[PDB]
């Protein structure tokens, strides 16, 4: 079974190693079965994002209470389907931003399993 922690890294972690989002949404099996309407990639280290689980406890958008907000803003890419996007030809607008991230955390080690929001 893919673990929940591995799925968060596959969906949202692209630590550095206009067309950014079209390249990245296919690679991660996020355009493989359907066009995921919105996805955010985080360009900070896995350690800095995992650290958010020890930062400010906040309510998730849905009302779950195991979410955590990063104290600093972080470098992120929002990928959003464009009007011409239609599976299986998915297509995305890229908007780079610097925002606090909010993640839901689970497990031991206690790590992100869900990307909830950026603000």
């Amino acid at each position: 079974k893919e673990t929940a922690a591995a799925k968060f890294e596959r969906q949202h972690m692209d630590s550095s190693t206009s067309n950014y989002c079209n390249q990245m949404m296919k690679s991660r099996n996020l355009t493989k079965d359907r066009c995921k309407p919105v996805n955010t990639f985080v360009h900070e280290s896995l350690a800095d994002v995992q650290a958010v689980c020890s930062q400010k406890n906040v309510a998730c958008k849905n009302g779950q209470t195991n979410c955590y907000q990063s104290y600093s803003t972080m470098s992120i890419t929002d990928c959003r389907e464009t009007g011409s996007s239609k599976y299986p030809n998915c297509a995305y607008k890229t908007t780079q931003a610097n925002k606090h991230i909010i993640v839901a955390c689970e497990g031991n080690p206690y790590v992100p399993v869900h990307f909830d929001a950026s603000v």
Partner: nanobody
Amino acid sequence: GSQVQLVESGGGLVQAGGSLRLSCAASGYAYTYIYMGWFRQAPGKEREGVAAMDSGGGGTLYADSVKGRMTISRDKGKNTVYLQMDSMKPEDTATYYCAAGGYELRDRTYGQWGQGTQVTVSS
């Protein structure tokens, strides 16, 4: 203190039919944990959620097996949680753990855990 600690007190040895109070206070965390709760692991069993409550005194949930004998409260301070246990049963013998920062009785969602307090209910 750079580290967060969930300090547990109370618990220990009691007769079947008796009463005990567990208390937990977090130190080292600068904000308010929205949910805190008590979990336990009894001999022969997996860890299970016993009781949980949110920082406004609501969202209260209990394991069905302890409902009506145990009472959780938080109203005595920031990041504190207490468990009053009455009419105790042999099946309540367990290591009890304070936990903070999760949601309801879902133990995977809690990221801070006390070291564990033994509670032994003598037959």
